[PDB]
Design a binder for this molecule. Structure first.
Ligand SMILES: NC(=O)c1cccn1Cc1ccccc1Cl
Length: 133
């Protein structure tokens, strides 16, 4: 029942500072423009200890499955090949991606009826808000 309040189908309804976050990550112009338009659906499910997060959008469809605390390889939507570890910290899913000596952290939390996604690269944060679909 670890992540019960995350499970479901979620739709992106607002984004702030995502272009600057993607710049800080190293995403190139064309991908930033097209990826910034997307309004993904995020589908979260749990089966035993395995959590699956799917993102479906006009830009890219992605899917990760993982066990908390157990590192896995991830190819991100912008085509980075990263090593990811996701933990639960005080009810927040904390997702750290490592690649090429760099690191970014994505935090996912429930706030009211929203799922709030905070993406941090160095000093730059983007906040992406999802609602139930
Ligand atoms: N994986 C990440 O660090 C991340 C955080 C928020 C979105 N993403 C993937 C992403 C999707 C489209 C374009 C650029 C990127 Cl960085």
């Amino acid at each position: 029942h670890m992540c019960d309040a995350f499970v479901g189908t979620w739709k992106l309804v607002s984004s702030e500072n995502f272009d600057d976050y993607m710049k800080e990550v190293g995403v190139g112009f064309a991908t930033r423009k097209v990826a910034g338009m997307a309004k993904p659906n995020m589908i979260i499910s749990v089966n035993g200890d395995v959590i699956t997060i799917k993102s479906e959008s006009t830009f890219k469809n992605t899917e990760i499955s993982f066990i908390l605390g157990q590192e896995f390889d991830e190819v991100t939507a912008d085509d980075r090949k990263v090593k990811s570890t996701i933990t639960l910290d005080g009810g927040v899913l904390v997702h750290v991606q490592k690649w090429d000596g760099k690191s970014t952290t994505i935090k996912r939390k429930r706030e009211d009826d929203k799922l709030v996604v905070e993406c941090v690269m160095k000093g730059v944060t983007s906040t992406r808000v999802y609602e139930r679909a």
